[PDB]
RNA sequence: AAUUGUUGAAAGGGAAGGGCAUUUGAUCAGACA
RNA sequence: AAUACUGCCAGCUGGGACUGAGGACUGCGACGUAAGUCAAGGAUGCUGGCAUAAUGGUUAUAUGCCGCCCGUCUUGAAACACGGACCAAGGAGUCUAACGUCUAUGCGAGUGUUUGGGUGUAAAACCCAUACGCGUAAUGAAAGUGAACGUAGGUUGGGGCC
RNA sequence: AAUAUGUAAGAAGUCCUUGUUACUUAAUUGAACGUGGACAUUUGAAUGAAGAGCUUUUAGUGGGCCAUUUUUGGUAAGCAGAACUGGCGAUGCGGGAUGAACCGAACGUAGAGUUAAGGUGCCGGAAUACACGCUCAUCAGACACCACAAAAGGUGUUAGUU
RNA sequence: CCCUGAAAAUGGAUGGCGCUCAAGCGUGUUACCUAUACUCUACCGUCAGGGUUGAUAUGAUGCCCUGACGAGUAGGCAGGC
RNA sequence: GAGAACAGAAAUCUCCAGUAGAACAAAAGGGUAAAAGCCCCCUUGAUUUUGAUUUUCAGUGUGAAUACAAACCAUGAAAGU
RNA sequence: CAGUCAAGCGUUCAUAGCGACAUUGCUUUUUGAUUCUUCGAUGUCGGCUCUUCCUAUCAUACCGAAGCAGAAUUCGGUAAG
RNA sequence: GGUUGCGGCCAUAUCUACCAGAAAGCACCGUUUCCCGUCCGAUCAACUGUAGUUAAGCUGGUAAGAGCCUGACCGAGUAGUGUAGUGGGUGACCAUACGCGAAACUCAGGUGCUGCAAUCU
């Protein structure tokens, strides 16, 4: 037998196909698994994976986050790709041109994207336009804006938000939280 | 009802599963507990050389 | 019950070396430390203030803060199955410059030389350290040196 | 020859996989030194005959 | 410990800047192969000099073939060994035909009569006894008397099948 | 002669009941199973390794 | 079903039953073409 | 001179055993002046026997070797520890309220039709106004105050893209 | 001392130029953070790398026992308590007749071969093999862990010493 | 090496029979026996690395090449009945 | 140790030697000689505000401690403390 | 319960019979120490009965020794018929 | 080279007995009006640098000196120790295998090095 140096029969631990069961999603995967095996172009491997990602690892790219990304230097004509839904944002008053490839655009978002004299491309029209993904700008949403990550890593001096079901005084704001009731965190 | 008292049998075995992580190194470490007077000035002196480099792309 | 205080067990650990007690000699307060110096911790029996804990004795670490009488050293402390970072507020009598790094520097300044002096010559350099290689071929001569036959010797007592 | 590239030339070779020696071991008990009539440690020039029986 | 060969071995205190050409000492080891022989050489040198293998080097290891291997000799042998109660020197006399064939039976005799294994003997000296009557020990002197002869009675024959139809002789 | 510059090592002892340190060197020499066997370049910084695992 | 009578075959020198394998007895599939 | 011993040959050669995976071609070679040939990326050629209980499967028995009673609790059970004579049939992590991580789906700065009304082929499906709930503000015991110096900053790694 | 143990072996490196400040100097002095510039994989030891990093949530467990070495109390204990490692537990296989922990070796289903520990009179596969000695017991002796023997004696015999 | 020192309770244990120039003790030399280990092959399953939507027939969680690994209580998960 | 009326083994005075063989509340172990010991002088920093840090650690708490920051003070010629 | 050395006891004389100081053992009908087995249970003193075994033999058989004249005793061997 | 003020390392500088020290420097040394402190102008303070001295301080040399320092195949590859065995032994303990390796001991050699600044036949 063998002094094993590594845990045998290990599973790789990366998704290998979306866990979702959407026919259309799985078609997109066939588009891109093909594209990615036969194109030697980065952007096809990144997109392929990201299509496998769960809702939590697909935070919404907002429309204003997109707006901003174009203001990067020399970026204003690239076509932005959001593997996941894209949300509207009344907080920008203006919004530029460009062309947004995305899994979904909300009602509000394509409105503003089109209203600005723009285009909303589903992920497979982007394939045709940019087989090597030429001239793309991939955005990710923010993954740790999630509520849950607040409560992760809780413990003393981590300043990390109780799992608590009402709040207010009377709700975990005395002993062990203040110098004058026992101690502090 | 006396019972074993203490031991350390089988605790380097366990230590070396997930195996004593190396300490993790960060360029730009924390200033935690560095001289409060040093920091006051340094904050002002960082604010200065900042300014001097926006004035440098004018 | 058992005893377990801050200085316990440190009997000889904190003692003074032989015929070396009394005040400490002034170079100890002359040496200058700035952030990033490597230091060797060794408590001084005679300076009770700002004394390292017995644990960090013989442990090296790096100064992260410099202050009127003291350096701030961080030291990596493997507790459990990990290492934590501890910052230690030592006094100058208890710290010292680690020569651990000298050999590096005396070899990097030297690794500059050999590099320039050879590049400006016509390449070929090789300046990586190599372990001790086995010995080569040799002829050990016999002239003025005939071999001297030895034997084992019987069993004596002498007492 | 242990030439300039012996590290990558050597590690390229997947660790060898010998049989138990054909003749047998010639010792009676193996886990003593070679000098002490067992099988382990450096036996030098003789590591061969051993190997050419395990191959 | 095995079937023995004699080896001269030669080593010398690894040279230094201020002592190149150190001095060279030889032993004659009685061993089975050359790897044991050098082991013994260092075993014994560190019993006389400030050396170890770590700091010296073998200069030459050479087998020594018996000079007249069809000349029966009378060998005196000098030994030091450890018993279960202390250590002691000895002297025996072995009649055989090469220094090495004698060292073989020595280690056997030492083992059978004095339960001493290889690890506890030291071969102080082996020497060809020139003139007879310097042969001290009796179990040897028996074989040096003139026109010596002797029968081999009650001779016993190695039967090659399980059953026999005769009934043996021991005649001779 | 020149001291030998290259060594060949074959693992003799089986897999189990082996102490932590040499049990490590056996790995770094890729000798993780009985009767397999690798070459090793002879230098002090491995000669010590070689030492550390003679019983096996 | 436990348990029972009959009948039939078979084994049984201080339990019975099981594993690997084969002899022998009984019984059976497939496969030729 | 020989021999022994130790070592090497990409020197010849006999007997014996187990395997025969693969299924067009494709590779690296080898022999030939050449045509072709080959043992070169896994067995083919020739000859015979039965076409059946011959081979094979099941089963009873016998023979070689091996085989302690299972369940449990225990450092340790075949235990001189407990339950268990045998059979059948019942026989043990549920449902609910309120929650954590995770995942799927919908919609998204909002989201939730189902208290209710409308309506129906009537406990279904279909539809819906007003609120409400959670979210979109925080922080202080409270009175209270309340998120752009700046391309929503600077630095250092960052996939991807240019 | 041995064994054990802290740090270091570069790009987060090195060298020149000279910017910021409210700290700090007698002092543009220094400290700290910087802009501009010079040198690439022999870029600074060896061996390995079926990659490395990272997060969230949850089971069982929280009676332990043995072996070598170190080691405390006890005359001791198959006793009670520590240290390091290896084990048993949770693990079958081969050896130790027998046996949780010893030796060997760790298990997918098979075939051929070679072995380990241990063995080869017969039981029992395998030399009533070879070679030198020793031993004769009117309670011989016979293989680690292991299933116990001591001081003291012998003109049994053996080989040695002065 | 052997003997004496050497006394317990059912009858009994170098495992048994038995063995005495041993089948005993020390030591040496070879040959030989056989584990679920080692080497080679086959098959199963696991993990991994690659190849392959081009229609006009049948599976794209599919097909094809390749390598390595396989002990297991409490316990996790998976895929199935 | 060698010296001085009563004065004795021990009262007080002097000189020499003296690495600490003393003392520092307390157990013990460290530590300390122009001191950390003894005699003196001036004192309240045994103070105010709130963080970091070490040991114990879960890297909670409590206890104790270190080094800064910001006050107001003590001492001293001063560096300082 | 049994030894070894033998200073001594024994008129004399170490060992007929004993034996200090020391030291080596054995036994498991003492008593301790331990808590491995049994707490969904091994009926728990003594006697009665009756069997068998051990020997560290009290008697009986045959012996060696004696500080055995005889008689009595004593130490010892083979001995549990 | 000397000396002095300030030093660094802190006995190769220390301890004991002698001896030598030119020049300048240090010293001892003279006084008590004044600041200042003492039971005591001894120490501490002031004034003189005049009135005296190399006695001592101080510097250096001596010694089969003590101490301290350095070294060596001096002891010693010893003691201890990491690793190995189904090694030996009733045990107590002990050989051997691959490595690491003391302390004492004994002999030799040594007896302050040196920085800043002023000064000196
Ligand atoms: O036997 C006897 C015990 C003493 C108490 C009651 N039973
Ligand atoms: Mg995902
Ligand atoms: Mg994200
Ligand atoms: Mg929020
Ligand atoms: Mg959460
Ligand atoms: Mg709250
Ligand atoms: Mg705190
Ligand atoms: Mg209890
Ligand atoms: Mg207990
Ligand atoms: Mg416990
Ligand atoms: Mg205590
Ligand atoms: Mg202590
Ligand atoms: Mg002192
Ligand atoms: Mg204090
Ligand atoms: Mg064979
Ligand atoms: Mg052969
Ligand atoms: Mg063999
Ligand atoms: Mg054996
Ligand atoms: Mg072979
Ligand atoms: Mg040897
Ligand atoms: Mg030696
Ligand atoms: Mg010896
Ligand atoms: Mg024969
Ligand atoms: Mg290697
Ligand atoms: Mg190496
Ligand atoms: Mg070696
Ligand atoms: Mg019967
Ligand atoms: Mg047909
Ligand atoms: Mg030959
Ligand atoms: Mg050949
Ligand atoms: Mg075929
Ligand atoms: Mg085929
Ligand atoms: Mg040709
Ligand atoms: Mg061909
Ligand atoms: Mg048929
Ligand atoms: Mg048939
Ligand atoms: Mg048929
Ligand atoms: Mg047939
Ligand atoms: Mg037929
Ligand atoms: Mg039947
Ligand atoms: Mg059957
Ligand atoms: Mg059986
Ligand atoms: Mg059962
Ligand atoms: Mg129990
Ligand atoms: Mg048990
Ligand atoms: Mg059971
Ligand atoms: Mg029982
Ligand atoms: Mg129970
Ligand atoms: Mg029952
Ligand atoms: Mg049922
Ligand atoms: Mg139930
Ligand atoms: Mg879940
Ligand atoms: Mg969704
Ligand atoms: Mg809203
Ligand atoms: Mg409804
Ligand atoms: Mg109704
Ligand atoms: Mg309607
Ligand atoms: Mg309404
Ligand atoms: Mg609402
Ligand atoms: Mg909220
Ligand atoms: Mg707020
Ligand atoms: Mg407040
Ligand atoms: Mg107000
Ligand atoms: Mg502002
Ligand atoms: Mg403002
Ligand atoms: Mg910066
Ligand atoms: Mg040592
Ligand atoms: Mg290390
Ligand atoms: Mg400026
Ligand atoms: Mg630059
Ligand atoms: Mg490296
Ligand atoms: Mg590598
Ligand atoms: Mg990899
Ligand atoms: Mg858990
Ligand atoms: Mg838990
Ligand atoms: Mg508990
Ligand atoms: Mg728990
Ligand atoms: Mg429990
Ligand atoms: Mg011990
Ligand atoms: Mg115990
Ligand atoms: Mg073990
Ligand atoms: Mg384990
Ligand atoms: Mg258990
Ligand atoms: Mg286990
Ligand atoms: Mg096991
Ligand atoms: Mg077995
Ligand atoms: Mg075995
Ligand atoms: Mg073994
Ligand atoms: Mg039998
Ligand atoms: Mg047989
Ligand atoms: Mg008997
Ligand atoms: Mg007897
Ligand atoms: Mg008996
Ligand atoms: Mg017998
Ligand atoms: Mg033994
Ligand atoms: Mg046994
Ligand atoms: Mg005795
Ligand atoms: Mg004896
Ligand atoms: Mg004798
Ligand atoms: Mg003798
Ligand atoms: Mg014998
Ligand atoms: Mg019985
Ligand atoms: Mg016996
Ligand atoms: Mg036998
Ligand atoms: Mg026998
Ligand atoms: Mg024998
Ligand atoms: Mg042979
Ligand atoms: Mg043979
Ligand atoms: Mg096996
Ligand atoms: Mg198999
Ligand atoms: Mg695929
Ligand atoms: Mg499994
Ligand atoms: Mg299944
Ligand atoms: Mg089903
Ligand atoms: Mg008086
Ligand atoms: Mg008190
Ligand atoms: Mg004290
Ligand atoms: Mg002072
Ligand atoms: Mg007083
Ligand atoms: Mg207070
Ligand atoms: Mg804490
Ligand atoms: Mg915590
Ligand atoms: Mg903690
Ligand atoms: Mg912790
Ligand atoms: Mg608490
Ligand atoms: Mg404290
Ligand atoms: Mg006695
Ligand atoms: Mg006596
Ligand atoms: Mg007498
Ligand atoms: Mg007498
Ligand atoms: Mg008398
Ligand atoms: Mg006597
Ligand atoms: Mg006993
Ligand atoms: Mg007993
Ligand atoms: Mg009794
Ligand atoms: Mg119990
Ligand atoms: Mg009991
Ligand atoms: Mg019971
Ligand atoms: Mg009962
Ligand atoms: Mg009972
Ligand atoms: Mg009963
Ligand atoms: Mg009862
Ligand atoms: Mg008499
Ligand atoms: Mg009478
Ligand atoms: Mg009478
Ligand atoms: Mg008698
Ligand atoms: Mg009777
Ligand atoms: Mg009887
Ligand atoms: Mg003068
Ligand atoms: Mg004065
Ligand atoms: Mg003078
Ligand atoms: Mg003079
Ligand atoms: Mg002076
Ligand atoms: Mg001297
Ligand atoms: Mg020794
Ligand atoms: Mg050792
Ligand atoms: Mg072992
Ligand atoms: Mg042993
Ligand atoms: Mg003893
Ligand atoms: Mg050694
Ligand atoms: Mg000496």
Q: Are residues E140 and E85 in the same domain?
A: yes
Q: Is E45 helix (H, G, I), strand (E, B) or coil?
A: helix
Cα separation, A167 vs C67, whole angstroms: 44
Tell which residue, F31, F11, F27, F48, has the closest CA to residue D31. Answer: F11
> Torsion-angle region of residue F7: left (phi > 0), alpha (psi -120 to 50) or beta?
beta
Smallest CA–CA distance from D44 into chain E, residue: E35
| The pair of three-digit structure tokens given for residue F15, joined into one six-digit string | 């897999």
Smallest CA–CA distance from E46 into chain C, residue: C152
Q: Are residues E110 and E140 in the same domain?
A: yes
Which DSSP string corresponds to A119-164?
EEEEHHHHHHH-TT-TTEEE----TT-SSHHHHTT-STT-------
Q: Considering Cα of E74, then E78, then E81, then E86, what sign does the dihedral take? A: positive
| The pair of three-digit structure tokens given for residue B22, joined into one six-digit string | 């190396």
Inside any domain, residue E137: yes
Q: Are residues E88 and E40 in the same domain?
A: no
Cα separation, C43 vs C50, whole angstroms: 9
Name the CA radius of gyration of chain F, rounded: 11
Q: For tokens 């698994």, name the residue.
A: A33
Angle at which helix A63-70 crosses helix A107-115, to 10 degrees, equals 30
Which DSSP string corresponds to B16-50?
TTTT-------SS---TT--HHHHHHHHHHHHHHH
Q: Considering Cα of C140, then C144, then C150, then C156, what sign does the dihedral take? A: negative
Inside any domain, residue E9: yes
| The pair of three-digit structure tokens given for residue C147, joined into one six-digit string | 């071999």
Q: Are residues E65 and E81 in the same domain?
A: no
Name the CA radius of gyration of chain D, rounded: 14
Cα separation, E7 vs E36, whole angstroms: 10
Cα separation, E121 vs E30, whole angstroms: 11
- CB within 7 A of strand J (chain E, 106-125): 107-108, 111-112, 115-118
Q: Are residues E74 and E129 in the same domain?
A: yes
* DSSP class of C92: G
Count up the domains in chain E and report the number: 2
Tell which residue, E65, E58, E75, has the closest CA to residue E123. Answer: E75
Interface probe, candidates B19, B35, B39, chain C, greatest C C-beta count within 10 A? B35
**DSSP-assigned beta bridge partners for residue F39:** F8
- C38-40 and C60-66 strand pairing: antiparallel
Q: Are residues E23 and E81 in the same domain?
A: no
Whether D25 contacts chain F with CB within 8 A = no
Strand H contact at CB of residue A173, distance < 7 A: yes
Inside any domain, residue E159: no
Q: Are residues E56 and E80 in the same domain?
A: no
- Does C150 sit within 8 Å of E124, measured CB to CB? no
Asked if C75 and C94 touch (Cβ cutoff 8 Å), the reply is: no
- Does C155 sit within 8 Å of E124, measured CB to CB? no
Inside any domain, residue E128: yes
Among E69, E93, E126, residue at a domain's last position: E69
Among E31, E48, E69, residue at a domain's last position: E69
Cα separation, D31 vs F11, whole angstroms: 11
Among E15, E37, E69, residue at a domain's last position: E69
**DSSP-assigned beta bridge partners for residue E148:** none
Q: Are residues E79 and E140 in the same domain?
A: yes
**DSSP-assigned beta bridge partners for residue E77:** E92, E126
Q: How far is CA C56 from CA C39, C41, C75, in A?
A: 12, 6, 8
* DSSP class of D15: P
Chains D and F touch (3+ CB pairs under 8 A): yes
Inside any domain, residue E168: no
Residues in chain F after which the backbone breaks (C–N beyond 2.5 Å): none
Asked if E42 and E61 touch (Cβ cutoff 8 Å), the reply is: no
Inside any domain, residue E93: yes
Q: Is A30 helix (H, G, I), strand (E, B) or coil?
A: helix
Q: Are residues E139 and E77 in the same domain?
A: yes
Q: Are residues E86 and E142 in the same domain?
A: yes
| Domain, as residue range, for E119 | 70-146
Cα separation, A8 vs A74, whole angstroms: 49
Q: Are residues E82 and E135 in the same domain?
A: yes
- Report the CATH number at residue E58: 3.10.20.10
Inside any domain, residue E155: no
Maximum distance among all Cα pairs of chain C, rounded to whole angstroms:
75
- E25-31 and C148-149 strand pairing: parallel
CA of E112 to the centre of ligand 106 (A): 10
Mark which residues 138-157 of C lie under 8 Å from E by CB.
140-142, 144-155
CA A141 to chain centre: 4
Tell which residue, E128, E130, E132, E122, has the closest CA to residue E97. Answer: E128
Cα separation, D32 vs D21, whole angstroms: 17
Cα separation, A141 vs B19, whole angstroms: 35
Find the helix or strand (DSSP H, E) in which C87 lies.
Answer: strand C84-91
Inside any domain, residue E62: yes
Q: How far is CA E146 from CA A44, A116, B35, C64, E74, in A?
A: 106, 133, 108, 99, 16
Asked if A32 and A48 touch (Cβ cutoff 8 Å), the reply is: yes
Q: Are residues E76 and E64 in the same domain?
A: no
How many Å from the N-terminal Cα to the C-terminal Cα in chain F? 28
């Amino acid at each position: 037998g063998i002094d094993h140096t590594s845990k045998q029969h290990k599973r790789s631990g990366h998704r290998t196909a979306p866990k979702s069961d959407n026919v259309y999603l799985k078609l997109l995967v066939k588009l891109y698994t093909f594209l990615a095996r036969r194109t030697d172009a980065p952007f096809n491997k990144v997109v392929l994976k990201a299509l496998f990602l769960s809702k939590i690892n697909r935070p919404p790219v907002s429309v204003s986050r997109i707006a901003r990304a174009l203001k990067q230097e020399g970026a204003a004509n690239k076509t932005v790709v959001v593997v996941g839904t894209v949300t509207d944002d009344a907080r920008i008053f203006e919004f530029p041109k460009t062309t947004v490839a995305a899994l979904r655009f909300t009602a509000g978002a394509r409105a503003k994207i089109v209203k600005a004299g723009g285009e909303c491309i589903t992920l497979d029209q982007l394939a045709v336009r940019a087989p090597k993904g030429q001239n793309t700008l991939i955005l990710r949403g923010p993954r740790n804006s999630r509520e849950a990550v607040r409560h992760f890593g809780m413990g003393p001096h981590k300043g990390k938000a109780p799992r608590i079901l009402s709040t207010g005084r009377k709700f975990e704001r005395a002993r062990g939280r203040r110098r004058s009731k026992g101690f502090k965190v | 009802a006396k019972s074993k008292n203490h031991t350390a049998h089988n605790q380097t075995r366990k230590a070396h599963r997930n195996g004593i992580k190396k300490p993790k190194t960060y360029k730009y470490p924390s200033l935690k507990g560095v001289d409060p007077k040093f920091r006051r000035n340094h904050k002002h002196a960082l604010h200065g050389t900042a300014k001097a480099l926006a004035a440098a792309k004018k | 019950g058992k005893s377990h205080g801050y200085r316990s067990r440190t009997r000889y650990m904190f003692q003074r070396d032989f015929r070396k007690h009394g005040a400490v000699h002034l170079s100890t307060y002359l040496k200058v430390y700035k952030v990033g110096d490597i230091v060797d911790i060794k408590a001084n029996g005679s300076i009770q203030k700002g004394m390292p804990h017995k644990f960090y004795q013989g442990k090296t670490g790096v100064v992260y803060n410099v202050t009127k009488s003291s350096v701030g050293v961080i030291i990596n402390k493997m507790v459990g199955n990990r290492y934590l970072e501890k910052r230690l507020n030592l006094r100058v009598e208890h710290i010292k410059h680690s020569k651990c790094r000298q050999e590096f520097l005396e070899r990097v300044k030297a690794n500059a030389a050999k590099r320039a002096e050879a590049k400006a010559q016509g390449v070929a350099v090789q300046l990586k350290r190599q372990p001790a290689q086995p010995r080569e071929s040799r002829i050990v001569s016999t002239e003025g040196n005939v071999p001297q036959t030895l034997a084992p010797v019987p069993y004596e007592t002498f007492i | 020859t242990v030439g300039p590239h012996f590290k990558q030339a050597n590690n390229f070779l997947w660790p060898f996989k010998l049989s138990n020696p054909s003749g047998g071991w010639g010792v009676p008990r193996k886990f003593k030194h070679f000098i002490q009539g067992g099988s382990f440690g450096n036996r030098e020039e003789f590591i061969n005959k051993l190997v050419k029986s395990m191959n | 410990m095995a079937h023995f060969k004699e080896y001269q071995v030669i080593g010398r205190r690894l040279p230094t800047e201020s002592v190149p050409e150190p001095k060279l000492f030889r032993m004659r080891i009685f061993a089975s192969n050359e790897v044991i022989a050098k082991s013994r050489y260092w075993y014994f040198l560190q019993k006389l000099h400030k050396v170890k293998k770590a700091s010296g080097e073998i200069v030459s290891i050479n087998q020594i073939n018996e000079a007249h291997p069809t000349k029966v000799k009378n060998f005196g042998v000098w030994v030091r060994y450890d018993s279960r109660s202390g250590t002691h020197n000895m002297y025996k006399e072995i009649r055989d035909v090469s220094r090495v064939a004698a060292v073989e039976t020595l280690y056997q005799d030492m083992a059978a009569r004095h339960r001493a294994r290889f690890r506890s003997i030291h071969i102080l000296k082996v020497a060809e006894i020139e003139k007879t009557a310097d042969v001290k020990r009796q179990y040897v002197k028996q074989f040096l008397t003139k026109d010596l002869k002797f029968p081999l009675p009650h001779r016993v024959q190695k039967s090659t099948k399980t059953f026999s139809y005769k009934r043996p002789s021991t005649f001779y | 002669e020149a001291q030998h510059k290259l060594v060949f090592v074959v693992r003799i002892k089986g897999i189990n009941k082996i102490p932590p340190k040499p049990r490590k060197v056996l790995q770094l020499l890729r000798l993780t199973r009985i009767n397999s066997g690798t070459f090793v370049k002879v230098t002090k910084a491995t000669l010590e390794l070689l030492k550390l695992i003679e019983p096996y």
